[PDB]
């Protein structure tokens, strides 16, 4: 089948970066997949193929003249309804093709996506990850005094005080890492990305309900018309001048497959609009644990004006990824915190789990 | 066939972490393939194909108007049972589809437990395996002075009193471990995925008995029935009004598909209810050795309440990931202990195999 | 077919190890690719599809009818016999069915031996081998020095007095190994393993034998039989009541297939019978270079008593894995000494390759 | 199909370089697989197959009659015209022919890049890579001792005085670089090749549009044509000497293919232009950054005279690869420095960032 | 069908060597590849297949009388020409044999290429790259005190006659590379196989022009033939002697095999000449520079005599691999001196780029 190769060759499967969301890899999955699975199961072994239109030939014509009746009339499907204006039943004839240019327009928006923002996309995590890779060796050193210090002199001379100047001295302030950020913030160069790629996934799917609403769903509970040869030479010929009674036998595949359509993106389209609506308000779960981390509060310090930003998709690209292998350590085991008081468990629990 | 391609695109085959206990995968496995192997041998060349239902129409009647009566009822599988209360055939016609939605509805659950747990019981596991690995360098490079001062000694001053103090130091107690598990037992979030997993399998298989008792068990023996044509624009035809002898080609398939689907589910349940029970209770088969490291002690410390929690799901997931490269060692070779006596014994058989 | 997705589904092909005795690999592959592969050649373009039964229809039939009358059969099998007693040929249209049951009920046990005893035996032999491993660098260390005094002496008072003075001595003594032997002697648990895996074939081709001996041999030179159609609603018609001269065109497949399966069987049994009784005896073919090895000797100093052991299978299962990258060295150079006599050679062959 | 394993044949998928930038990728692509995905739709199972021509044979032949009648003017499809001027509609015959050889003649240029510009290529970019590779280690030090004066110094003295001999001085000149890039700023070779790439695929792109309507658009609406048998030793029969109504069944997918083919290649003109137009013009979007630097700034020193050298390409391909990994670094983020000034921010920003 | 699988067991595609030239790859893979694609394009689904002969049998005969007519006269091809002389038309029914034989025999000279010719040919390779990489760092690592005392001397005493002592001295000489080469020119044990694996292409090619013309040629514009039955046990019968007008289906296929067939072979040919030929002279495009070069001068040093011999195929082949990745090298940088005058730059180049 058509449909087999197109599978691997559309929808198919650095080396440390996931550049898709979970949800977005599903959407697009889904919706390129579906239209694929439903025309493979539409004409396959599944359901009996051979001649899909049926004509109530006269008992004097052979088998030749009914094959001619019966296979003139598809290339030339034309219904006279007389309840002499003329009907025509092409979405019959058109839905494989249909299904095919709906799959490659719902395609589309994906090439647009990894051609239009993946490498600057990538340039930025790197060089972010590099500089927040560097904090926990920047950070251990620079508080390895402050274990030294607690035992001898008060909780204001270790905690209120001696971190006055210890965190402001310059071991830990990175000014290119806040320069970056400040200038990528007033960029708007990349969000256009992400809102037109769900807007063609929007615009493409209401047009898929505008073609379903406008062809079909009017020769829906038809299986019964009435075609005609004498329109040519033929014309001047002793026989049937209209055909009676051709019935189409494949309407259950078309009931079936315009259903599975309508349904599957009447499920869709939810999820779609809440990743749209992911990106209109600022988050800040995990805030209260990035203000205390030294190079974490960076981020949470550039909070504020709209949420159309790059800073955004930079923030939502780096949380998907700040567990991959060395991330993926004691920042995931600061969950225990969670209810002065932090002045002893606080630092016994990072100078424990060193490496 | 298309059941080829979805055998690996739905039941197909970190880098150090088995997240997959093997009675989920068989029951996986079983589960998401009876469907489809079933409907591959039904639609393949192990029966011969052709025309699923074959009518006896009169001998006046034509090749091509036989094919048409006969092919105008297999789209619209109605009895006109006699024994005139009209009678559907449809389960003949839809059985594949259901197969497949079968297919798939067994699948579903799988993907909310990748998408849902998977990483954080990674992570948990990968931080509790990491940490648990220092505990080998603990037990025989700090005790090891116990049989090197107990000879120039007595019992009670180095074997009851002496091993309390070094049982008690710096180099024995993992506090933030200590606090971890006591947080993770407190959660709830994890166990729960396992619970809708588990029943969401037996509500499908409640569904599909539901399905197969409504529904079939009726056409079972039935092979034969009769159908109308003159519906419609052949009603005003000079022919038998009422068609004679169709009968069903494939009821030999649809009994064997029926019963092996009964009978696959029906030994299916006991291995899912077991499954369910196994997390109803905690575990100690091991405990009496693990009471003695320095480290797998927390772990025995803690049982009490009620055993649902994820702590539970934790130490069964690290039960078979105990074996895999560096604790795939001397823990597995205390096994010769199974029958004061720990005077001798339990300190030359650790200590003669270091590395 | 069905039949290839089944072969690399089924039989198809740490990291330094072997869970499968060697022979033992053929009684598997021969039993469980043969029904598969006789289904596949049952039916195949070779030989070549379409109608498996034939019927001599009256002229008067029309081609409809024809194929009316012999497809009512071929799910219906059953002669007619007058030499009234009904006789079915159920068999023709179940060999597929039977194959792929057997080829599922071969397979079975394998899982077994897979899930019931491959963990604790690879652990086993990590840790045995972990010891022989160290068992090599022995002879040079106190070994090497200790014959290099019979050039200082004689013989009776230095290599019979002596010799065994740093043989007793505790360099050659590992306890913990030797415990480790000793408890597993003792235990039972992976035989019954073995017993199970060897039965269940046996069980099985006896049952396979009992099938093709009760149920075909009868059926095997009869190629006509006679139906009939008049059982129903088509009673009441003017046509031949009981069918005439139908025959069976697939008779020689079926003739093949049974004496291919009957053959292949019966070659196959004492493969098996020799597998079982392989265990029943303790292995002494290289014991003489064993005893003198230094750590080797252990291995058959406990050999004792009734041989169905676990220390048997052990034994079993290590003699081949004797060569894999590191006891594939001079272990198996040791094949030269084969015919006091070891005060030189003995050790002139093993200080000259050292590494 | 054939038309499945030429796509893996042709249009299928060092070690660190680009040389094809994305935009040929998509034009070759697009030009290659279109042809072959018309030609895989035009005969597949998309659309039901069997005897492309039917006649309507008189009611008197027989079914082999009627077979020779329309399978002997299949290869000899000649209109006999009244409208005797005989027309032949050879096209519908040999549209899949010449589908293959646009295909092969789409594939040509691509051979003749690969084959003949590629070695002259290759090496000088490998070389031009390290050689401006040394450019980092030679920034920072080269004009280190100059903050080193900064402070000990005011006026244009630091920075207009004293680094100016430092500019010139032999650390900072790259004299191998010099000659280089004069001699291949006259040559003419590779520059040459390229124009040949483009101006091949823009004169098959005329000469399919020359066939497409010198040949087609005269047979378009043309379903329904006659013609002869008596015209050799079947002249001497009693039959009809001209066929009368032969319908060509399969005239839709000849105006799908007809209009695809015109589309898709009037859609592709306008991106070979811009191709072919891009080395028209000297590229200086971002030349203020690298007219700075220690080895970029020759570069940029060098851009004078026609544009059509190899210089032009050697900057096109360099610029693709300077992202791989090492100049995947610093040299991305001199985005910020974009609005004397260059006294901190410039070198506070270049130290901050070692590595 | 089997050219699917014939490709890739043919045509299909050390660790650092090119042992076969691009313009042989090239010959090689259209030579074996056009007749496998010729044959699949005859006998696949682009033209609709069937029978390829058809007769038109009397009205009288029935379907099975027809097919037996025209398929006993498939296999016994005869014509019973009247322009009583017999005239055959095997051809039509040998052509996959002979284009399959051909496929064979194209392929047949790369085997012996590959098993004649490979393994001396790697070696002698492997040791010249080996034995000439050394010749880096003995001009700039020996040679590089000659400008270090040109300033402190003059013309004749430190460039005339101080480099000619130490270019006879134990740096520069290469004795053993010097003596291989002298030995190597003389044998002629490998120039063999490349003129046997011409020859044996251009018999091969003769071969296949003598049987297109001898057997081709002679029937392409016959499409009709008259058959006889009448020639055994069917004599006694009262029908037709002779059979009437028996057309052949498949003459176009017949025609475009042949003309593509003689086509690609007169293209190919003179690629296999200009190939012969390469091999009758010296080369010496670039000797310029390689008659400086330590161990480079004594490639150029032996060109005398005939051509005909191991040097001349060595130097071939290793001039294509003289950039794999350590001669991709300043050696290949050398293409600026294209124009005493090697006073500096033949110097300052050298020690420039060192590594």
Chains 1, 2, 3, 4, 5 share one sequence.
């Not at 493979?40 to 359901?47: R, Y």
């Not at 979405?91 to 993946?118: E, G, N």
């Not at 040869?229 to 051709?246: A, Q, R, W």
């Not at 600022?282 to 190079?295: G, I, Q």
Request: net charge neutral.
């Amino acid at each position: 089948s058509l449909a087999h190769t197109a599978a691997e060759y559309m929808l198919s499967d650095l080396k440390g970066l996931r550049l898709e969301l979970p949800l977005d890899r599903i959407v697009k999955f889904v919706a390129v997949g579906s239209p694929l699975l439903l025309m493979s199961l539409a004409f396959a072994q599944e359901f009996s193929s051979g001649s899909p239109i049926s004509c109530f030939s006269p008992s004097n014509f052979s088998i030749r003249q009914a094959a001619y009746v019966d296979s003139s009339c598809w290339d030339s499907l034309l219904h006279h309804k007389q309840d002499d204006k003329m009907k025509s039943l092409w979405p019959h004839k058109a839905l494989p093709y249909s299904l095919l240019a709906l799959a490659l327009l719902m395609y589309l928006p994906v090439l647009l996506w990894q051609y239009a923002a993946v490498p600057a996309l990538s340039s930025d995590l790197l060089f972010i990850i590099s500089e927040l890779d560097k904090s926990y060796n920047r950070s251990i050193r620079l508080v390895q005094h402050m274990l030294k210090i607690r035992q001898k002199s008060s909780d204001p001379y270790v905690f209120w005080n001696e971190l006055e100047k210890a965190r402001k001295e310059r071991y830990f302030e990175f000014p290119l890492l806040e320069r970056y950020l400040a200038c990528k913030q007033r960029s708007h160069s990349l969000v256009a990305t992400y809102l037109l790629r769900n807007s063609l996934l929007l615009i493409f799917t209401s047009a898929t309900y505008l073609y379903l609403g406008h062809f079909h769903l009017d020769v829906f509970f038809q299986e019964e018309f009435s075609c005609s040869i004498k329109t040519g030479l033929l014309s001047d010929e002793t026989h049937v001048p209209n055909l009676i009674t051709c019935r189409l036998t494949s309407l259950s595949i078309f009931q079936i497959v315009s259903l599975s359509s309508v349904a599957i993106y009447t499920i869709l389209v939810p999820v779609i609009i809440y990743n749209l609506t992911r990106l209109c308000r600022w988050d800040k779960r995990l805030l209260s644990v990035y203000e205390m981390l030294p190079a974490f509060d960076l981020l949470s310090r550039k909070m504020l004006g709209c949420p159309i930003n790059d800073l955004n998709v930079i923030l939502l690209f780096l949380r998907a990824n700040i567990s991959e292998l060395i991330s993926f350590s004691w920042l995931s085991v600061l969950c225990v915190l969670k209810d002065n008081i932090d002045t002893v468990v606080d630092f016994m629990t990072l100078l424990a789990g060193l490496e």
